[PDB]
Amino acid sequence: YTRVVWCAVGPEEQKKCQQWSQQSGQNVTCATASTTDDCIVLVLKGEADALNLDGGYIYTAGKCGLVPVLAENRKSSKHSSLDCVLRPTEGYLAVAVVKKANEGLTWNSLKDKKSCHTAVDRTAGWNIPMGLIVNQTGSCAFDEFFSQSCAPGADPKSRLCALCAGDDQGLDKCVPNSKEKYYGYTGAFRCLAEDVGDVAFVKNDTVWENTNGESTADWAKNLNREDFRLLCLDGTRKPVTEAQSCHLAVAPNHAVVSRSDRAAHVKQVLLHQQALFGKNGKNCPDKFCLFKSETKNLLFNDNTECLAKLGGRPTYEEYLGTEYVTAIANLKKCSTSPLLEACAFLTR
Amino acid sequence: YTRVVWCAVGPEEQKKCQQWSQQSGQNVTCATASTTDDCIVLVLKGEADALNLDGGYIYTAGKCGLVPVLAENRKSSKHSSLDCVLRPTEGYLAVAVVKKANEGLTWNSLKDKKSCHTAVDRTAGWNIPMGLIVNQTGSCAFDEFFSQSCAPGADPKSRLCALCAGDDQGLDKCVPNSKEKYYGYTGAFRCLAEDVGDVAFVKNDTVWENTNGESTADWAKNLNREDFRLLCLDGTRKPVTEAQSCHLAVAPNHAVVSRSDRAAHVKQVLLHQQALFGKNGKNCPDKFCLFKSETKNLLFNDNTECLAKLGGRPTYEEYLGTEYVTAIANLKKCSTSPLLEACAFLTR
Ligand SMILES: *[C@@H]1O[C@H](CO)[C@@H](O[C@@H]2O[C@H](CO)[C@@H](O[C@@H]3O[C@H](CO)[C@@H](O[C@H]4O[C@H](CO)[C@@H](O)[C@H](O)[C@@H]4O)[C@H](O)[C@@H]3O)[C@H](O)[C@H]2NC(C)=O)[C@H](O)[C@H]1NC(C)=O
Ligand SMILES: *[C@@H]1O[C@H](CO)[C@@H](O[C@@H]2O[C@H](CO)[C@@H](O[C@@H]3O[C@H](CO)[C@@H](O[C@H]4O[C@H](CO)[C@@H](O)[C@H](O)[C@@H]4O)[C@H](O)[C@@H]3O)[C@H](O)[C@H]2NC(C)=O)[C@H](O)[C@H]1NC(C)=O
Ligand SMILES: *[C@@H]1O[C@H](CO)[C@@H](O[C@@H]2O[C@H](CO)[C@@H](O[C@@H]3O[C@H](CO)[C@@H](O)[C@H](O)[C@@H]3O)[C@H](O)[C@H]2NC(C)=O)[C@H](O)[C@H]1NC(C)=O
Ligand SMILES: *[C@@H]1O[C@H](CO)[C@@H](O[C@@H]2O[C@H](CO)[C@@H](O)[C@H](O)[C@H]2NC(C)=O)[C@H](O)[C@H]1NC(C)=O
Ligand SMILES: *[C@@H]1O[C@H](CO)[C@@H](O[C@@H]2O[C@H](CO)[C@@H](O)[C@H](O)[C@H]2NC(C)=O)[C@H](O)[C@H]1NC(C)=O
Ligand SMILES: *[C@@H]1O[C@H](CO)[C@@H](O)[C@H](O)[C@H]1NC(C)=O
Ligand SMILES: [Fe+3]
Ligand SMILES: [Fe+3]
Known part of the structure; x- marks a missing residue:
């Protein structure tokens, strides 16, 4: 388990994941499903390791046992x-x-x-x-x-x-x-x-x-x-x-999230992937850029300088x-969420 | 669906019920009708979960399948x-x-x-x-x-x-x-x-x-x-x-009444809601008092100390x-109510 399996949401995000993967040297690889909830299911199942998520999805990811690795800045x-x-x-x-x-x-x-x-x-x-x-x-x-x-x-x-x-x-x-x-x-x-x-x-x-x-x-x-x-x-x-x-x-x-075990790994791989392909990245714009997707905010936000570290290694x-x-918890008293129901049943 | 939707009769019972949401963090929510009967209808449809009723309406709601949950004391x-x-x-x-x-x-x-x-x-x-x-x-x-x-x-x-x-x-x-x-x-x-x-x-x-x-x-x-x-x-x-x-x-x-499918959930939320906001309220009158009305006798009677548990799942x-x-039967032999006719068959 050296490769980092990235989940991309939809096909537009998949094309960008391909490039990232080819250029990384298989150091980072791709999984894809049609929605963020689906991708959070991949990370649980372990058909993938990591993705970047809006707070919203992090709550969900977070309820399902996943932890944050790096936060956009x-x-x-x-x-x-x-x-x-x-x-x-x-x-x-x-x-x-x-x-x-x-x-x-x-x-x-x-x-x-x-x-x-x-x-x-x-x-x-x-x-x-x-x-x-x-x-x-x-x-x-x-x-x-x-x-x-x-x-x-x-x-x-x-x-x-x-x-x-x-x-x-x-x-x-x-x-x-x-x-x-x-x-x-x-x-x-x-x-x-x-x-x-x-x-x-x-x-x-x-x-x-x-x-x-x-x-x-x-x-x-x-x-x-x-x-x-x-x-x-x-x-x-x-x-x-x-x-x-x-x-x-x-x-x-x-933030980016992963399973607990794969966090520290994913941290290191990413800090190095952004040093390579980041905004101030040796190979940007030489070969491929990770924080540029054509105003389509793919994988990360386009306004992202880098991925900063998380003080005290914090919970969701x-x-x-x-x-x-x-x-969130209050708003969610108003809805049924199958994902959030299942995670509850299988992270008691 | 964790939330319990209070049915509130008229716009003074609404203002108090609204607050109850806000200080209970949507542990409790509001539906409104003009009248007590229309409200009994909303609990039937499942557009609301429960309300407090004089024994009079409890006969009505009973004939229509609703069960009682907690008496006023x-x-x-x-x-x-x-x-x-x-x-x-x-x-x-x-x-x-x-x-x-x-x-x-x-x-x-x-x-x-x-x-x-x-x-x-x-x-x-x-x-x-x-x-x-x-x-x-x-x-x-x-x-x-x-x-x-x-x-x-x-x-x-x-x-x-x-x-x-x-x-x-x-x-x-x-x-x-x-x-x-x-x-x-x-x-x-x-x-x-x-x-x-x-x-x-x-x-x-x-x-x-x-x-x-x-x-x-x-x-x-x-x-x-x-x-x-x-x-x-x-x-x-x-x-x-x-x-x-x-x-x-x-x-x-x-008493409080609800559908048979929501009783135990409704009670749990109430027993604890009355602990937070009742007479010996953790947050009464700090935040909100469940048995005290700006006007008078709103949602409950103001002479209410707490809501008592019943016997073994009693019927109306x-x-x-x-x-x-x-x-009641003998007085209703002389005049028909829409909600009693429309429901007459559920008890027969
Ligand atoms: C709403 O969102 C907007 C972002 O999408 C925000 O507007 C942006 O504000 C930032 C503030 O950081 C602007 O960044 C600029 O970039 C320069 C980098 O070269 C900064 O540094 C320069 O200034 C001083 C010199 O005086 C030194 O720090 C350094 O030498 C350097 O020369 C600039 O100072 C400046 O910040 C960015 O351009 C803005 N974006 C746009 C499109 O205008 C906005 O603040 C947000 N609003 C709120 C309230 O959050
Ligand atoms: C008719 O209407 C009235 C309601 O509006 C009723 O009057 C109320 O009745 C009670 C007495 O029955 C009054 O309060 C009492 O006050 C006592 C202290 O002063 C309380 O404390 C005592 O009781 C227990 C004992 O175990 C303890 O808590 C305590 O140590 C102490 O000894 C009493 O418990 C009791 O509340 C009340 O003020 C009256 N209300 C008003 C507004 O005047 C009346 O009973 C009704 N009659 C009938 C037959 O229904
Ligand atoms: C809104 O409803 C929830 C109940 O659905 C209330 O908080 C939850 O219930 C209890 C408090 O009565 C908490 O459990 C307690 O915490 C310890 C520590 O885990 C536990 O071991 C004990 O069983 C103890 O009862 C519970 O943590 C809490 N649940 C969550 C998810 O926070 C809440 O009080 C109600 N809020 C309002 C404003 O009414
Ligand atoms: C990630 O991919 C890079 C190559 O794209 C690998 O980085 C090399 O690692 C070795 C030893 O670990 C270093 O000595 C070199 O400095 C790196 N090479 C270059 C060109 O920078 C790395 O092995 C891959 N890691 C994982 C976990 O897949
Ligand atoms: C739900 O919304 C209400 C207001 O609509 C919030 O309660 C108000 O917040 C003020 C701020 O100090 C408090 O003094 C009062 O308790 C409330 N206002 C009034 C007019 O009573 C409530 O906090 C909200 N819930 C959450 C979780 O934010
Ligand atoms: C009315 O009287 C009849 C008997 O003639 C009886 O069945 C019923 O209980 C009475 N109802 C009331 C309110 O007294
Ligand atoms: Fe967002
Ligand atoms: Fe009465």
């Missing part, structure tokens, strides 16, 4: 002195992004509006918002709070899989991988911009990245900041600029937080 | 050597309460007088008084025996909904919930106290708690118990102290008792 505003791999992890800002166009659409007016979702179970997309809606209404009927929505991974027939478009042909509509046109940070934000939904549930960084021609993608070229406002909890409406005083909650950074709880673990 | 009139939750439930005193000023008024002369009732189909407001009024005049014209009434739950465009005042702008008159000024125990007394009625059919407890400024409520502040008399079945009057000797019947205490017949059931 990105451009800070402090000590350039400290090495990226030792630079402390910041944690991203989950926001509800609307258009200034949409008059009188505050947080409290979201009732029966249209919504764009990264995916079900994800932090910014789903846990932070649906957490705060579900609690406030003291109702588990989140499935009925928005008139219509795009949350891939939700029931394809249901009204959360209304606005979801699919791929090139409109096949495999509302599947939680990149094949879905409105999937992920980017796909949800395209959704708000193309005016399919009144609000998007993505992160601060997503907005900037896809506004003011900071994006080669056709749909994001023209877009400008002032045509997008942030809903604050208290009820106010503020510009994307003021995300510090107008954000729903603080997200823990997309310790990493995510006691606050956000409480939030 | 108040401060004992014996030695509380046992824990409240194990202390036997004592019953409560259903009584005719007249003003003293109105001499010449007795039980024997109630005919053609105005009447106030908790609500239609309840135990103190209806099932005992009207069940006896029909008992003695050998006539099923309870719709006629009083000149007018307030009896929220009756036909809005009838005489039993004549005296009912509704809310603030007096809308939704006679709607059987706390938004109707003379709804329930409280309202039946406030009815008799604002002399819109010659009699009010409430329970012994109701008088002491609203007389001699044992209530901060403006109408109940300057009310004195010596301006009130209890009609017995001999034909005599008597003062609020002779209740044990001058009462119509002994009502079985308010067992918990109400073969007596109070045959008396």
Whole structure:
């Protein structure tokens, strides 16, 4: 057991995994399934060793006995002195992004509006918002709070899989991988911009990245900041600029996970794989780059500087937080999750 | 589905039930209907899980398959050597309460007088008084025996909904919930106290708690118990102290009801929810008090110390008792209820 078996979600992520694998020298190899939940099943079964996961999926991974290995990190505003791999992890800002166009659409007016979702179970997309809606209404009927929505991974027939478009042909509509046109940070934000939904549930960084021609993608070229406002909890409406005083909650950074045994191994292999193929990687852009996927945030986020280390070797709880673990657990009192049911039965 | 969905009757029972979610972390959640019957419907459909019911509605919900789960229990009139939750439930005193000023008024002369009732189909407001009024005049014209009434739950465009005042702008008159000024125990007394009625059919407890400024409520502040008399079945009057000797019947205490498939889950969550927020609450009144209402008697009665366990999985017949059931049966021979007909076949 020297090779590291990486699970890729969907085919777009599989192509990038191939390259990584060829170029690594079989040092890192590929497994693939259609969803993140599926891939977390591969790691359990041991048809794979590791993948990078949104907090959301980490809770799940975490309940199923998997542990975090490295956390993504990105451009800070402090000590350039400290090495990226030792630079402390910041944690991203989950926001509800609307258009200034949409008059009188505050947080409290979201009732029966249209919504764009990264995916079900994800932090910014789903846990932070649906957490705060579900609690406030003291109702588990989140499935009925928005008139219509795009949350891939939700029931394809249901009204959360209304606005979801699919791929090139409109096949495999509302599947939680990149094949879905409105999937992920980017796909949800395209959704708000193309005016399919009144609000998007993505992160601060997503907005900037896809506004003011900071994006080669056709749909994001023209877009400008002032045509997008942030809903604050208290009820106010503020510009994307003021995300510090107008954000729903603080997200823990997309970590990598594995089984316990394979953690230390996976740690070493990755620290070396990123030294080779990272942003400041000898063989980047010489042969292949791991943190570049064509604004498709494949395997890792594109805004990822490196993968920093985890102080005190922490539990899924310790990493995510006691606050956000409480939030998820409550929201999850409202749903049945087969994966999370099975793991409970077979990690008692 | 860990969450327990409380069914809350009307928008004052909603505000308290909503909070209960927030301080229980969605361990408990809200559904709402206008009326108690509509709520019994939501528990049937499974759109909610449970609510607390006067024995009256427990007959209704029973006929429709719901089972009882936990009785209400108040401060004992014996030695509380046992824990409240194990202390036997004592019953409560259903009584005719007249003003003293109105001499010449007795039980024997109630005919053609105005009447106030908790609500239609309840135990103190209806099932005992009207069940006896029909008992003695050998006539099923309870719709006629009083000149007018307030009896929220009756036909809005009838005489039993004549005296009912509704809310603030007096809308939704006679709607059987706390938004109707003379709804329930409280309202039946406030009815008799604002002399819109010659009699009010409430329970012994109701008088002491609203007389001699044992209530901060403006109408109940300057009310004195010596301006009130209890009609017995001999034909005599008597003062609020002779209740044990001058009462119509002994009502079985308010219980929680749910589907048979959710009972043990509902109970577990409650027993512990009452431990956190009950009378001896870890968080009562730190965070939220389950047996204390901003208005009055919301979700539960405020005289509730704890919710007691029952005997061995009792049916609606067992918990109400073969007596109070045959008396209800005989009063319902004279008038049909939609929810009782629609369910008639489940018991037959
Ligand atoms: C919302 O998301 C955005 C990210 O997607 C955030 O905007 C970015 O802010 C970062 C802050 O780190 C910007 O990084 C810049 O990159 C330079 C690297 O060369 C930095 O260093 C320079 O400045 C000083 C010199 O004065 C020295 O440190 C050094 O010598 C160097 O020259 C810059 O200082 C700067 O940080 C990044 O460009 C921004 N991205 C975009 C697209 O504008 C934004 O903060 C997020 N908002 C919140 C509230 O979190
Ligand atoms: C009719 O209506 C009234 C309800 O509104 C009833 O009046 C209440 O009755 C009780 C007494 O039966 C009153 O409280 C009592 O106060 C005692 C101390 O002052 C309590 O403590 C004692 O009991 C136990 C003993 O084991 C211990 O806890 C303790 O050591 C102590 O000895 C009593 O337990 C008891 O609560 C109550 O204040 C009255 N309420 C009001 C608002 O006045 C009345 O009984 C009803 N009558 C009938 C027949 O139904
Ligand atoms: C909401 O409901 C849950 C019950 O579903 C409550 O917390 C859970 O229940 C008990 C507390 O009564 C906890 O168990 C206790 O912890 C120790 C240590 O493991 C255990 O050995 C004992 O059996 C003990 O009873 C349990 O840990 C806890 N479960 C989880 C997953 O946290 C909770 O109190 C309720 N919250 C509210 C706000 O009502
Ligand atoms: C990972 O792949 C690399 C080659 O791509 C291997 O790295 C070499 O390891 C040896 C001995 O362990 C070192 O002395 C060399 O410095 C490395 N070679 C180069 C060119 O850097 C490594 O063996 C592989 N590891 C695993 C676990 O598969
Ligand atoms: C569920 O939401 C409610 C508010 O809708 C949260 O409770 C409020 O938080 C404030 C903050 O100090 C507290 O003072 C009050 O208890 C609540 N507000 C009001 C108006 O009562 C509650 O904390 C939320 N639950 C979680 C897990 O965050
Ligand atoms: C009414 O009287 C009949 C007997 O004539 C009896 O079966 C029933 O229990 C009585 N109901 C009440 C409320 O007294
Ligand atoms: Fe995320
Ligand atoms: Fe009652």
